[PDB]
Design a protein around this ligand. Structure first.
Ligand SMILES: *[C@H]1O[C@H](CO[C@H]2O[C@H](CO)[C@@H](O[C@@H]3O[C@@H](CO)[C@@H](O)[C@@H](O)[C@@H]3O)[C@H](O)[C@H]2NC(C)=O)[C@H](O)[C@H](O[C@@H]2O[C@H](CO)[C@H](O)[C@H](O)[C@H]2O[C@@H]2O[C@@H](CO)[C@@H](O)[C@@H](O)[C@@H]2O)[C@H]1NC(C)=O
Length: 30
């Protein structure tokens, strides 16, 4: 089943593609 993946968008730390999060909130690296 073909999934429509997002574009060059970031996920919120690996969550849904509609949610975005910076690295500082994901791996605390900032
Ligand atoms: C963005 O791209 C998503 C899939 O992208 C992958 O493939 C493309 C090209 O094959 C890669 O590069 C993308 O395209 C190039 C040139 O066209 C550049 O613009 C890059 O910046 C761009 O990222 C891309 O990197 C690949 N991704 C990965 C992870 O490898 C989708 O096609 C996305 O489309 C949206 O998807 C969501 C759910 O995933 C919904 O289905 C949206 O409805 C859908 O787009 C909607 O329609 C669009 C055109 O009709 C547009 O109006 C959009 O705003 C709507 O939300 C796609 N999104 C956009 C904005 O292009």
């Amino acid at each position: 089943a073909p999934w429509l993946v997002p574009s060059q968008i970031t996920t919120c730390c690996g969550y849904n593609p509609g949610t975005m999060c910076p690295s500082c909130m994901c791996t605390n690296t900032c």
